[PDB]
Amino acid sequence: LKAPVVVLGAGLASVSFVAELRQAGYQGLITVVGDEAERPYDRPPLSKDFMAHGDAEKIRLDCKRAPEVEWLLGVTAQSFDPQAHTVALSDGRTLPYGTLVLATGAAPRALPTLQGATMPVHTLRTLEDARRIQAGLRPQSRLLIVGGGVIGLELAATARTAGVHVSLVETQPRLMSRAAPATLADFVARYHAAQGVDLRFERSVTGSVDGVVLLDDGTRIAADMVVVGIGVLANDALARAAGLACDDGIFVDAYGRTTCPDVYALGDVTRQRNPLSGRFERIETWSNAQNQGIAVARHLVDPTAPGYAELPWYWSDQGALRIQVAGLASGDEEIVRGEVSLDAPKFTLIELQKGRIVGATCVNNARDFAPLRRLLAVGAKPDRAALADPATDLRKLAAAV
């Protein structure tokens, strides 16, 4: 590993990586450049508890496993020269590097049809965003959310709890089309509708006039605030300019290597192999950011260590639904454990492909999730009758493997 180490971005992936470098035994220089003028913080609370409690000191990331790191907060890396091995900073300084790590994440995609709008329109990515939205979540106000993914739905739940009227516009015929089983998506729509969310499927926004949103069916929605959660775009501009292979995300191998010698990348900014699908994908989960960061650091310090190998998974807390999703959304088979019901929701889904577990969902059923992720990891082929059977406990079934 070539010193000094410079990391661009100070999000979860960055913090996780630098903490692992130190824990693995690297004692040379580490400098982290973070464009946000904020003590590094975790994003999941921004759509939930922060949106509701407003204390940023409850959401900071623990940097104590990363001693002796200089964090340049409020500074933007403007470019890097991979021949000179330097990074140019917005404050006029230049940093030298032996190893450069791009952990610059992703930015919310903006709505092109609302580009010249005159009502409040916000995205939800940063603490600044969350505070700005927080200030607008007054009881009885009218919130329109654009996008029925995890941002929109987590915010929908938080807003309804605060007594805010919520309408939500989604272009697809379903919610969470990105990385969720249809059975889950259907249930989640039923849940939100029952909580008073006004869902609009297969509708695109065509624009707005004076505090009113226009749709593709030729109709209107008036709103006090719009929050746009329509996905992200990788923050890969420095990589594109420097000649790295990128396409809405920096291509990396399991060691986090880019196409440019001595430059690595990790987290939301990367496109990487999903071992379950065998395809290159942006894996934009909290667990990826942490675990890919850790694996890349571990292998830089110890080249004998394996490359990143974890299978993808996430959670989403949407009001009364604590959702956990691992692996692939579908296979050739779905097994449902429990009844799927709005009365005290509690169930598990298991996706199989030719008898092999390729994915799993738990809704208010955390006890089942860890054993299913272990079965997933080893490509388990359990008895499908037993997988369905309510009498089977999965912790023991996983233990038998």
Added chain:
Amino acid sequence: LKAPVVVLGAGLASVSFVAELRQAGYQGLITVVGDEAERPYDRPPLSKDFMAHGDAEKIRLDCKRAPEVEWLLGVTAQSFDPQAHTVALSDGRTLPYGTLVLATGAAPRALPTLQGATMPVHTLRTLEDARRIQAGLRPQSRLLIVGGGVIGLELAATARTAGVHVSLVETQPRLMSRAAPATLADFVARYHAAQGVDLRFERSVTGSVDGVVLLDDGTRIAADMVVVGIGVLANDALARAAGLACDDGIFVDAYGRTTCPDVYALGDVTRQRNPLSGRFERIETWSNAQNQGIAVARHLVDPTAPGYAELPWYWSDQGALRIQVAGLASGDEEIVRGEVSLDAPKFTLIELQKGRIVGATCVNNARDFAPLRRLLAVGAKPDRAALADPATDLRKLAAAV
């Protein structure tokens, strides 16, 4: 550039690259490993003149601009160790390298529903394939082609000229869906149908029984020979095993760099940025193989040289149609120069995006193609009236830019 240079694959991309290394001034060792036991040869004649004239000595690639190269023909690279900087060969030998170049191309995709068939089924990629098919193109025989792309259609034309009855099965509703304007595809279907080709659209093969092919509509086609032209899969196995970033093709930047230090890749095996679309794609054209090979070599010898920057283009000779296609298949606008007619076909298409030329097609109109590629290269925005106007000659219009 670190000597010695080892190239895996001895196709057009490989020959083009090694000739450029020598021409640019690199005088160190170059060793090329080619699995086919054939003097390097060009593939386009295999669906046409070779299929009809059968002389392989008319199709060899000119290696004289590549002096002092050892060509290991009939040898397969089995693996490489990018730490040890060695390549393991099927003949028991090992080659050292300073720089490793993966130019291993792509293999025809096989039909999963014909996997256990008992009639002749061939793909068309190699001289061996072409000879085997050649031997079967007897007058009045029944050929079924699976796939309505450039292989299938070029072969269809050659087979009809030889007096062979031709049926063709395509899964899409159109021919050449991969990289051809709809207007072209529609015309090409009319042309082949008029030449006696029995076209079947939106049909998938479900299998075969005793010299008869079964389709998804529940019908049959009996045939003496099947040729399968359903696309290719990148030959990226050595790269996948060695830990390079790959996904049906090796990701490279404009310098041909993979994610592994000292390992480059070029030609059909690569996924690379298409500057017109700004997306990563397999660019599987003859011009890419040659020109990407040349650009990668040039920049290895002279690091001040620019990365690969050419925009994609190809030709396809299908009987009486000499087709040339550059850039993107569609924009927001198509301009048609000439009438589109089976009576002495001759026309040009121009695809535009917000007034900018993004693609072009010429059918039996070669004079127009080079000037349109020049307009394409600079993102020209000519007068759209003039582009349509028959009186306009494009060579002069391009010259004005």
